[PDB]
Ligand binder design. Sequence first.
Ligand SMILES: *[C@@H]1O[C@H](CO)[C@@H](O[C@@H]2O[C@H](CO)[C@@H](O)[C@H](O)[C@H]2NC(C)=O)[C@H](O)[C@H]1NC(C)=O
Ligand SMILES: *[C@@H]1O[C@H](CO)[C@@H](O[C@@H]2O[C@H](CO)[C@@H](O)[C@H](O)[C@H]2NC(C)=O)[C@H](O)[C@H]1NC(C)=O
Ligand SMILES: *[C@@H]1O[C@H](CO)[C@@H](O[C@@H]2O[C@H](CO)[C@@H](O)[C@H](O)[C@H]2NC(C)=O)[C@H](O)[C@H]1NC(C)=O
Ligand SMILES: [Ca+2]
Ligand SMILES: [Ca+2]
Length: 339
Amino acid sequence: TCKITATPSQFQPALLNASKWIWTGENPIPGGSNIISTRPFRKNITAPCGKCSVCATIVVASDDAHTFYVNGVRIGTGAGFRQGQALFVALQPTWNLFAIAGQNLVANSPAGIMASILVHFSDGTSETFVTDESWKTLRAAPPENFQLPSTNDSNWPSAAVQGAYQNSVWGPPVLPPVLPLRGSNWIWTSDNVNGAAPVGSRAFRKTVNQCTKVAVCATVLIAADDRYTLYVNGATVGSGSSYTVADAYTIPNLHPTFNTFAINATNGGGPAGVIATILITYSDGSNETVVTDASWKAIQTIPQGFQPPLIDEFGWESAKIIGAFGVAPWGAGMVIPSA
Ligand SMILES: *[C@@H]1O[C@H](CO)[C@@H](O[C@@H]2O[C@H](CO)[C@@H](O)[C@H](O)[C@H]2NC(C)=O)[C@H](O)[C@H]1NC(C)=O
Ligand SMILES: *[C@@H]1O[C@H](CO)[C@@H](O[C@@H]2O[C@H](CO)[C@@H](O)[C@H](O)[C@H]2NC(C)=O)[C@H](O)[C@H]1NC(C)=O
Ligand SMILES: *[C@@H]1O[C@H](CO)[C@@H](O[C@@H]2O[C@H](CO)[C@@H](O)[C@H](O)[C@H]2NC(C)=O)[C@H](O)[C@H]1NC(C)=O
Ligand SMILES: [Ca+2]
Ligand SMILES: [Ca+2]
């Protein structure tokens, strides 16, 4: 419906600071003891006039457990209030139905769900939406298909606020990392042997091409021992020079079927590696994760136009796995931006 003029940017974290814990109010004491039960929560959110909504970064926490739905599609299950859970999803352009099944699993114990939904719009702006008293709930188990847009929540009661981010029985949940590096690998060209690699630049390429789906947004987390520059479909996304502080990016304007991620990474001397995690959202509400591994292509002398999407990859080798995230010399302590 809308032209997307947003361009790749530094990733913007969704925060919980304005969000509220909600439950049903079966106990009128907020943060009070509640029965073992499952309860539904719904909120129809519409885009401000003239803007189209594209995708969302979501952080959700629960006491005790939750299932998160968008426009009837299950996008995540999780549990716990000490640390939020990160979710990413593509959106309909003008309205989106968010639905959460929350579960209290311990008798006589508090119950609640808290979520923050950072919507990104076609024009490059964003707005956060939160769980609060405007959500609808029921003092009963969730009806069949409670999460589908076709269910009528007109006669549902309002959710009851259990507490605020900074004033609740739970205290403020810690934000999770935007994406895990656990699961990815430090990779390099195969001249990386015995713990070091030659001085110089190396290039890496990964193409994602699900021709029967519509890709919407990508989130990228990347770090390199020494420095890198990152490209998507030939356009520059960003660059960094730290292997202890990782960078996160949002790509809001993906091509619908074919996207090439390319990295020029440089070694100043000593050990070398590049590591990344990429999440792509699809318009059917599914996602896929890509990590640096041996399915990337790599080359030791970088050719002109190493970044364009459709170059000939003859003479590119499979990238070498230096080690899974955590290996020496870099270890497991990478600083990762908050989701
Ligand atoms: C991506 O989509 C999938 C399915 O829609 C989600 O992953 C699966 O579902 C649960 C929900 O968290 C995951 O914990 C499991 O690891 C997956 N199922 C398995 C391994 O059998 C995932 O939540 C989505 N990611 C988002 C929305 O960021
Ligand atoms: C969420 O709200 C939107 C907007 O209030 C609803 O969309 C409207 O639906 C009516 C009835 O079908 C249409 O006549 C309007 O043209 C729609 N407006 C817009 C701006 O799309 C939407 O149906 C609601 N969704 C749910 C699940 O309640
Ligand atoms: C790949 O990355 C390296 C480092 O960022 C680039 O090398 C730089 O090239 C410029 C010329 O435009 C020099 O002025 C800099 O001094 C170089 N820096 C370093 C650290 O060597 C290289 O040009 C990039 N692109 C390609 C295609 O290799
Ligand atoms: Ca509980
Ligand atoms: Ca080095």
